Design a protein around this ligand. Structure first.
Ligand SMILES: [Zn+2]
Ligand SMILES: [Zn+2]
Ligand SMILES: [Zn+2]
Ligand SMILES: [Zn+2]
Lengths: 77, 77
């Protein structure tokens, strides 16, 4: 298991705690991303302040961290 | 351990096998990324052919998969 650096809860394989990617390369859980400040469809990485621009799907358009999800599944299974 | 989906070698915590991110959310090891075919200043994801635009630093400008590296380091120790 691995924890989200913002909420310190463990990532889930899908749903409200799924790991999503910012353009700086950091992962944050979906829920924390919906709770971060938004300014004109732009979100700042909480760790390095770098900007990721959001599209029409918002946080749901941020890509899942596929390799992390594969590792978490392999560790679980 | 987790393998790069292209070369099937295991990721390293630094160096030529470090996991780097494409904008589609997939991770590929640094070395495979330097060996993949180029389409202009852009690289196509080897899994889904989606395009990631490269800057003047090429593959070195692709972000490391920080969360994956954190988990892999925890697994090593
Ligand atoms: Zn979180
Ligand atoms: Zn960041
Ligand atoms: Zn590789
Ligand atoms: Zn891809």
């Amino acid at each position: 298991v691995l924890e989200c650096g913002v909420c310190e809860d463990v990532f889930s394989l899908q749903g409200d705690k799924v790991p999503r990617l910012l353009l700086c390369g950091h992962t944050v859980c979906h829920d924390c991303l919906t709770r971060l400040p938004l300014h004109g469809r732009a979100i700042r990485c909480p760790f390095d302040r770098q900007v990721t621009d959001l599209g029409d799907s918002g946080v749901w358009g941020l890509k899942k961290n596929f390799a992390l999800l594969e590792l978490l599944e392999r560790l679980q299974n």
